[PDB]
Amino acid sequence: SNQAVKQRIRAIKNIGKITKAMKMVAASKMKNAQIAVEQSRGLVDPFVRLFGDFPAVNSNKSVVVAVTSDKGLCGGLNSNITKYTRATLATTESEGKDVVVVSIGDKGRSQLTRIESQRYQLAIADTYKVRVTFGQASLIVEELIKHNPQSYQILFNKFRSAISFKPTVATILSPDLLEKQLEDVTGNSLDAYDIEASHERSDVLRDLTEFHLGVTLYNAMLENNCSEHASRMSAMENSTKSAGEMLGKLTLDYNRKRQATITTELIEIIAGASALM
Amino acid sequence: EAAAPAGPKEFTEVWNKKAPSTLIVPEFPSNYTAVKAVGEGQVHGDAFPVNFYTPHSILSQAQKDTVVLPGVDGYFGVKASHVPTIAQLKPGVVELHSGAESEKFFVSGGFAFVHPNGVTDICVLEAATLDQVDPAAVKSALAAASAAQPTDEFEQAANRAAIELYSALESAVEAKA
Amino acid sequence: LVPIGRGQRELIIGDRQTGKTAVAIDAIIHQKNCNEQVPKAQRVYCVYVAVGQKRSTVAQLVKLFTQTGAMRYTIMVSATASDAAPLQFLAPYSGCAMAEYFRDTGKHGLIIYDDLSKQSVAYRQMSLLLRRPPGREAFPGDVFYLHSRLLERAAKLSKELGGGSLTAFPVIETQAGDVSAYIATNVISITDGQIFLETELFYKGIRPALNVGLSVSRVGSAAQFPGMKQVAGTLKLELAQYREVAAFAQFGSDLDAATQYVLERGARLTEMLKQKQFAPIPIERQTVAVYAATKGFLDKVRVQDIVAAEEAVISQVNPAVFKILKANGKITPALDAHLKAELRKVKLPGA
Amino acid sequence: VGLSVSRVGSAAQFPGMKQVAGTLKLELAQYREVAAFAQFGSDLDAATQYVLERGARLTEMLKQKQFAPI
Amino acid sequence: DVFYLHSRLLERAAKLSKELGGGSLTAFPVIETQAGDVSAYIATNVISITDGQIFLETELFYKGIRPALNVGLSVSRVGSAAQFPGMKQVAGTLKLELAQYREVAAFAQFGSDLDAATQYVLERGARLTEMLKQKQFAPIPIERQTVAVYAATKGFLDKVRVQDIVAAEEAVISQVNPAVFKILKANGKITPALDAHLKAELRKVKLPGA
Amino acid sequence: EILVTGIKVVDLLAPYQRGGKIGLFGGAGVGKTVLIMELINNVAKAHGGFSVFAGVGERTREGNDLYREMIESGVIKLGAERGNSKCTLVYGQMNEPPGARARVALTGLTVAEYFRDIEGQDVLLFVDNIFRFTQANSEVSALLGRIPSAVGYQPTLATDLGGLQERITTTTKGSITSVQAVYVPADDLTDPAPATTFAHLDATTVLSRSIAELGIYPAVDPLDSTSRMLNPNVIGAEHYNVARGVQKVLQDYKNLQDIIAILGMDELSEEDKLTVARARKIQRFLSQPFQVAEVFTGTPGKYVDLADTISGFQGVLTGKYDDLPEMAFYMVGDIKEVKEKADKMAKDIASRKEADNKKVSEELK
Amino acid sequence: SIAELGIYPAVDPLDSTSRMLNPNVIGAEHYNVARGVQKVLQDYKNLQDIIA
Amino acid sequence: QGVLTGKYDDLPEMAFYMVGDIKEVKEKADKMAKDIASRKEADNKKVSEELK
Amino acid sequence: ALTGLTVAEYFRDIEGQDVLLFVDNIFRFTQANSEVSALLGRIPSAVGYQPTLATDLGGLQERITTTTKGSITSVQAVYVPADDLTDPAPATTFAHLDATTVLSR
Amino acid sequence: ILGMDELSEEDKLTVARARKIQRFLSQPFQVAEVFTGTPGKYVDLADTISGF
Ligand SMILES: Nc1ncnc2c1ncn2[C@@H]1O[C@H](COP(=O)(O)OP(=O)(O)OP(=O)(O)O)[C@@H](O)[C@H]1O
Ligand SMILES: Nc1ncnc2c1ncn2[C@@H]1O[C@H](COP(=O)(O)OP(=O)(O)O)[C@@H](O)[C@H]1O
Ligand SMILES: [Mg+2]
Numbered sequence A: 001s002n003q004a005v006k007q008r009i010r011a012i013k014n015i016g017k018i019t020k021a022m023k024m025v026a027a028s029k030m031k032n033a034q035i036a037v038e039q040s041r042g043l044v045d046p047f048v049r050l051f052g053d054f055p056a057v058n059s060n061k062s063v064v065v066a067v068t069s070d071k072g073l074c075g076g077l078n079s080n081i082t083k084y085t086r087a088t089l090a091t092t093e094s095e096g097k098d099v100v101v102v103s104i105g106d107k108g109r110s111q112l113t114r115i116e117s118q119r120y121q122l123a124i125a126d127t128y129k130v131r132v133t134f135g136q137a138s139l140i141v142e143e144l145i146k147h148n149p150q151s152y153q154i155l156f157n158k159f160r161s162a163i164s165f166k167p168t169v170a171t172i173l174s175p176d177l178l179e180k181q182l183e184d185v186t187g188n189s190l191d192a193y194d195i196e197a198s199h200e201r202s203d204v205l206r207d208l209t210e211f212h213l214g215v216t217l218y219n220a221m222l223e224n225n226c227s228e229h230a231s232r233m234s235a236m237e238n239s240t241k242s243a244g245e246m247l248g249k250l251t252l253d254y255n256r257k258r259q260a261t262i263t264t265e266l267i268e269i270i271a272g273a274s275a276l277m
Numbered sequence B: 001e002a003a004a005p006a007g008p009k010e011f012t013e014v015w016n017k018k019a020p021s022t023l024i025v026p027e028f029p030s031n032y033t034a035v036k037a038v039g040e041g042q043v044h045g046d047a048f049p050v051n052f053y054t055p056h057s058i059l060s061q062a063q064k065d066t067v068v069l070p071g072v073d074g075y076f077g078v079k080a081s082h083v084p085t086i087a088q089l090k091p092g093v094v095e096l097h098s099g100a101e102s103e104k105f106f107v108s109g110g111f112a113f114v115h116p117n118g119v120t121d122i123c124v125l126e127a128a129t130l131d132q133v134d135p136a137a138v139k140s141a142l143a144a145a146s147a148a149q150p151t152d153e154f155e156q157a158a159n160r161a162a163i164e165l166y167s168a169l170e171s172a173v174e175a176k177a
Numbered sequence C: 001l002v003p004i005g006r007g008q009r010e011l012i013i014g015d016r017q018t019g020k021t022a023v024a025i026d027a028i029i030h031q032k033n034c035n036e037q038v039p040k041a042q043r044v045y046c047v048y049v050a051v052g053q054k055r056s057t058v059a060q061l062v063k064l065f066t067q068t069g070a071m072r073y074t075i076m077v078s079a080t081a082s083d084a085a086p087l088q089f090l091a092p093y094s095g096c097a098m099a100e101y102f103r104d105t106g107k108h109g110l111i112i113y114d115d116l117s118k119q120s121v122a123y124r125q126m127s128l129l130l131r132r133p134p135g136r137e138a139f140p141g142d143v144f145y146l147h148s149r150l151l152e153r154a155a156k157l158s159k160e161l162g163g164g165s166l167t168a169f170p171v172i173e174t175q176a177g178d179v180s181a182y183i184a185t186n187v188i189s190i191t192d193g194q195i196f197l198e199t200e201l202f203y204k205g206i207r208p209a210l211n212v213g214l215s216v217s218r219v220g221s222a223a224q225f226p227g228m229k230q231v232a233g234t235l236k237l238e239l240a241q242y243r244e245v246a247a248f249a250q251f252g253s254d255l256d257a258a259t260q261y262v263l264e265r266g267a268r269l270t271e272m273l274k275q276k277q278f279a280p281i282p283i284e285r286q287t288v289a290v291y292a293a294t295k296g297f298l299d300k301v302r303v304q305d306i307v308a309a310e311e312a313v314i315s316q317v318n319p320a321v322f323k324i325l326k327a328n329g330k331i332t333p334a335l336d337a338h339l340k341a342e343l344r345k346v347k348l349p350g351a
Numbered sequence D: 001v002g003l004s005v006s007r008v009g010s011a012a013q014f015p016g017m018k019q020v021a022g023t024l025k026l027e028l029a030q031y032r033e034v035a036a037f038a039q040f041g042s043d044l045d046a047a048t049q050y051v052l053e054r055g056a057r058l059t060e061m062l063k064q065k066q067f068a069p070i
Numbered sequence E: 001d002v003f004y005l006h007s008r009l010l011e012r013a014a015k016l017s018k019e020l021g022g023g024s025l026t027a028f029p030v031i032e033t034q035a036g037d038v039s040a041y042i043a044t045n046v047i048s049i050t051d052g053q054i055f056l057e058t059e060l061f062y063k064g065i066r067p068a069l070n071v072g073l074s075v076s077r078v079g080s081a082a083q084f085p086g087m088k089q090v091a092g093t094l095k096l097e098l099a100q101y102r103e104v105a106a107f108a109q110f111g112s113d114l115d116a117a118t119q120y121v122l123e124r125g126a127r128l129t130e131m132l133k134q135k136q137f138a139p140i141p142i143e144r145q146t147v148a149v150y151a152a153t154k155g156f157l158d159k160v161r162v163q164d165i166v167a168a169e170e171a172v173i174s175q176v177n178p179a180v181f182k183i184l185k186a187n188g189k190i191t192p193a194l195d196a197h198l199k200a201e202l203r204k205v206k207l208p209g210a
Numbered sequence F: 001e002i003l004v005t006g007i008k009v010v011d012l013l014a015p016y017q018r019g020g021k022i023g024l025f026g027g028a029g030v031g032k033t034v035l036i037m038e039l040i041n042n043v044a045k046a047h048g049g050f051s052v053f054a055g056v057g058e059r060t061r062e063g064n065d066l067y068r069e070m071i072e073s074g075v076i077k078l079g080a081e082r083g084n085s086k087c088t089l090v091y092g093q094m095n096e097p098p099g100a101r102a103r104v105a106l107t108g109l110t111v112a113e114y115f116r117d118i119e120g121q122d123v124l125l126f127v128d129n130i131f132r133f134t135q136a137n138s139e140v141s142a143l144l145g146r147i148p149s150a151v152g153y154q155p156t157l158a159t160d161l162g163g164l165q166e167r168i169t170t171t172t173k174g175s176i177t178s179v180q181a182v183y184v185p186a187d188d189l190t191d192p193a194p195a196t197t198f199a200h201l202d203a204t205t206v207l208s209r210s211i212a213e214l215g216i217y218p219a220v221d222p223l224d225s226t227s228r229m230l231n232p233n234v235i236g237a238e239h240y241n242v243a244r245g246v247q248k249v250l251q252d253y254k255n256l257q258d259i260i261a262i263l264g265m266d267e268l269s270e271e272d273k274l275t276v277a278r279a280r281k282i283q284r285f286l287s288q289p290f291q292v293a294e295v296f297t298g299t300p301g302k303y304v305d306l307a308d309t310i311s312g313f314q315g316v317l318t319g320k321y322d323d324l325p326e327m328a329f330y331m332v333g334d335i336k337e338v339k340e341k342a343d344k345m346a347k348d349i350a351s352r353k354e355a356d357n358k359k360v361s362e363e364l365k
Numbered sequence G: 001s002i003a004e005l006g007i008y009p010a011v012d013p014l015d016s017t018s019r020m021l022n023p024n025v026i027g028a029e030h031y032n033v034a035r036g037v038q039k040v041l042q043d044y045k046n047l048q049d050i051i052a
Numbered sequence H: 001q002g003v004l005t006g007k008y009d010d011l012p013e014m015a016f017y018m019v020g021d022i023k024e025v026k027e028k029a030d031k032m033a034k035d036i037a038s039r040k041e042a043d044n045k046k047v048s049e050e051l052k
Numbered sequence I: 001a002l003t004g005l006t007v008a009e010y011f012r013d014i015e016g017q018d019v020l021l022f023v024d025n026i027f028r029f030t031q032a033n034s035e036v037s038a039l040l041g042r043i044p045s046a047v048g049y050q051p052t053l054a055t056d057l058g059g060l061q062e063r064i065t066t067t068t069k070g071s072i073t074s075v076q077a078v079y080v081p082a083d084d085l086t087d088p089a090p091a092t093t094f095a096h097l098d099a100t101t102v103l104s105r
Numbered sequence J: 001i002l003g004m005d006e007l008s009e010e011d012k013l014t015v016a017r018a019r020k021i022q023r024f025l026s027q028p029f030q031v032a033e034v035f036t037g038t039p040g041k042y043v044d045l046a047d048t049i050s051g052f
């Protein structure tokens, strides 16, 4: 009965070493991802000061994207934004809007199917496998523009610090379908701008919102990848803590069993020798 | 005219009544920006804030005294209190002037917003500077890109973008000092 | 999975309240179900040796063996708990001498020594009171020879001696599933097979709680039904795959849609190997039910009611095919196509 | 190397072997602290990778070939 | 017979009947465990003899909480409904609030998600833990324990953070009029005319953490 | 035939027999004297015959408490009304020498056996710590000049315990329902006195220390407490199926707890999170307040009828109460009382303050 | 464990030893192949802790 | 030596199970490609209309 | 160790000084008394030790005290056998130790 | 895992205080001066309490 506890000590010890390796590799990958994230945050600002920030629009069709992870040892990231995804789908919906639900990452199709099984329509995965580039976000945005909504909702985790990840909803309106209608306040706020494009302002807004969706999507899945790494860094730190607790209790148990083993094996020898002497 | 009074402060007051009370309100990309567009000031004289961006870079976020942008109608220069503008940029050279020195950034296209408060937001995909360009592949690139034209309209568009980009690149790499 | 031939010692080892005597009870009840349909020569006469139990426990077993009718072929040797320690230590030898009458006269015996672990505790009591010096845990040195002397009497005799057989089923109780105990490792090395029953499989709904990985039968497939020698060779192979993919999916990492099909079918077979308490299945409604599971005919049936699905497979398939399967002993292609021709004309639940 | 010891220690070593073993045992100790973490190879760390590669350089040095004493 | 050794010793600690004098003998056997293992042999022998246990955990002792009473594991049911009625009034809500504090501390293995409804009981429990610890060789009379736990499980202590609750409890004992201790001692329980003056006298003390 | 006790975990997962031998296995402080006193309170009055309590090696304080509370219940009537008493007490408590504790169980059996055989009627025999019989025989057995057996015991453990326990049976003439507390020595169920006692019992109720450290009282291990009455031909198919379903849910939770402790609940599948939620719910729902624990807990104790606990556990198994929280099931009687405890817990979820003045704590009124 | 993986004969490839496994007895081609086989199997034995 | 160097990295791992030589591994790998490319035949024969 | 304690006890009792005693490896004192009890034919107690473990230790450790003349102070090296602080030799030794000084690498 | 300059301004004060505390716990010994060169410094109790 003392080789099962010994192999359990070996099991919990290699689990703890695996988990400390995972923690240190997530802490290294969080720092190399923080190079790319803080540079990509810049391009989000001109579109959010040019088009504003309008999350609760009365769109009759929206495409919602929950930016989830691929690997699953994050520790409650994808569940948190699935809660936020349905808590925005129960908020921005107003009149019977068609909502297309999309997920970026394998851990979104595992749970958005569990929440919105019928409105779920697209599943992007394997995106953080090599790296995240703007051509990749552009192709994903092209596949979202295959549908023609009046709004886009991007649900991602904004990497703030190494411990703080706030879920974020970033809204992109369709160019003259809803965006110009939300900018006119008795005249317009967009008619201050001298348009210097070739063709009409509807075409420059049609190009500009595709570019805004690609930028928002690229930054969203950079922020979510950095929060993924910094949340695996804390999930594999609590798991080393609990695998140290389990190992300490198992070592106390093993020493009790070792002492009891020596005592009973000695008492057998004394009882066998006292029957002869 | 504005039949959906949207915004973050409306979403945070409507979101309290349709969501569970445990979840705090989601953040929005307006809370992570600082310089707005309509707001007063933000120029102070001969300099003006120029945010030259890229998806993978922030090339400049200082203040400049004039910005030459390669618009689709032609090269224009943004001075301090410029007219508000949403200029679509042709493949060309942005030069950020800050005195006598000029950084010659060849962009590959994009946009450039001059806002009412005088903030210039150049927004391009790739912005190579001119020294890291080779003049060898651009000439066979123009020769080959002026050759292959099938009945596809898609390759006509891609080939027109190719010839205008490489031709502007030769125009801005054979005319340097 | 653990087939048993006539003349083999097969240990039913397990923890405290698992299905240990239930496997032994069903093997005795089933012999009454077979003795009415075979000729006079190949009838099995059972002996149940009940060492160190209550009188109340064995009075529920004679009540059970009289109710089913299995008492017509069953001796019931019972040295209970209030009996003297040399009556519990002697009762398997007394019972084996009764069972060896059938072995020595051309007939077939079947002896079940329920708790040989309790026969060793009664032998340790006599040895320690006769001042014989204690050994491992307190036991005498001769305690391997206590059980190997007894279990080697279960044989399969030659045709010069009649051709009789004696099949033993020793029962050994472990403490925390610790099969590395002293008396447990003696009988594991004596007996040919081993039927390890686990308590954590018992509470997961798997009844009989047979650990498929640890349960051996050293006679192999050479002493089983040829109709199930061919359909259950893949059953013990598909369940070997299912054990591995269910250890990794316990974490909740990934599924591959070819790894998940292994985890899908293996969960069909573990619901297929379930059986209720006092109703043994003949041999041919077993291998039809394993034919329905190892040929895909119970796919698109929900995992919750494959127990409820196979009453339909036995009821709706006509009893003409069970007679051909029993009389041939093997699914001929004249039957194998005609079996699956009728295994589509069945109303499974759900569908 | 972690469990092996010599209670005489450095007082009874070859001088000159004493000059290289002082960093050999330290470098092997660091490699043992970062041991079993070299299963993450593309999942690099760029500072533990140097001590992992040097520890693998040093443990393959100490191997010997059976009645060929040096 | 090491069970009988301790059983025949501790069984002599009885409460005799009225015709035998009414005398009593209270026993406090002390058992030292090794590494917190209370499932040892002599430990479980004496747990089967005595009427309750006072568990003293080394983790609570190393964190400065002294007396390091494991509040969840320590039991005295025979002494319950045989205790101070004034303390039995206050100690019931003390026990429930400490039970909630233990379970909202087991709920938080981590500092990352705040609830602000469990944070109330997580600060009330760290208030009561700091209230409960006392220093050595100075035992406290039962009325000054009752008044202090009355001032802890109710209000009158929410302004001090976690730090000055020892100083606040000493200020509660010193600054409250010492007649109310006499009324609590002689009446035994807290009458309505007594907890009136309890709510009155506790608001006019000056707590040092402000 | 079933013996309904009013305890949810006993009547569901390990139901007692009306003439059965019942063992309560415990580990020094896990609550088998509270459970055997609740079985006295619940069973001994609904049962119409006589009752015998044999105290073998226990506290004399508990014997005095049992005597004084059997007097004021009218079960023991003092004086000229002594013939209308329903219970006889035999006491060999732990201050007695090892010869008196090794034979007082036999005095209790003799008093019960006369009622079973000569008087011919149904008896309840409550033996508090039948382990002390075995321990007292092992105390006197070293001085009888015997070679000791395993861990330290007498060589004749199994036959001594068997000769005692084979007499506590029902016969053709009478019936003894036997409830025995069985102490386990160092929380070790493989110790030979519990491991030998396990064979003699129709219904073992195994009490755990780790269950009691979760606050779940009675601390019955639901995956180690068995009965011979958990049989679909005895208790009905619905009761058998809900008991096996509860046990399957709890076993899958126990299989999950090793990865729950390390990886947290965030790494589970969603059917696994349903398993964990329903298993925590039925773990709390097997807990129950006792009418003999109401003196030291304040909660009044609930008798739960068999149909009520069957329907309640069937409803938690099907999914009808997935909306209710975990702690609404804790220490409640029925499946109505989890709903009223959610009603009580929910209403407070707002009621936290606003008791400022208009008090009774004035200075003149 | 090798028998329960379906591999027969269930010989432990690492735990089995011979005095004939010397390079000057069986040659170097047999010895280097045997040592490389055992090296790859011990590498997988260390990697099976992190794969599972 | 072949399976250690990488000469047979293009064969399935179940082609090595219970076969004598590496010639047997090559005969087993292509026998498995052969049988699993012959699994689509029970689709329209001997369900009904059989030739006795 | 009794001989060294006598040499210290002269300085304590007769010279009236504050003496240091260095019982190097008190575990080896325990080990040697265990071997002496085993050779004398005594039945060993828990894990393997002498039945007189606490008494053979307390016979040594109770003569290292402060008297009205002087004091003896002991800096006893302690060995922990299976890195097990609940082993009866260090558990019995730690019941006497008033301080621990851990030297670490 | 984060960097020595990742820390707060108060935790760096504790690092700079503890790093000079654990330096101050060392002491040159009077018996060690025959092989270390530096003379040994006996420290009284009041000096220790006041300096620390
Ligand atoms: N196949 C089965 N299906 C359902 N229930 C079963 C099955 N086998 C056994 N049981 C139940 O499990 C309990 C234990 O069965 P069994 O009598 O075989 O135990 P055992 O191993 O002999 O235990 P012990 O040795 O303690 O008597 C019995 O009450 C029985 O009702
Ligand atoms: N059903 C219960 N409800 C509440 N508390 C209990 C219950 N059972 C036991 N306890 C707690 O456990 C303690 C031990 O109970 P007891 O029955 O005397 O244990 P044992 O007889 O096993 O030593 C009691 O003092 C009580 O505090
Ligand atoms: Mg049995």
Ligand SMILES: [Mg+2]
Binding pocket: F032, F033, F058
């Ligand atoms: Mg008790």
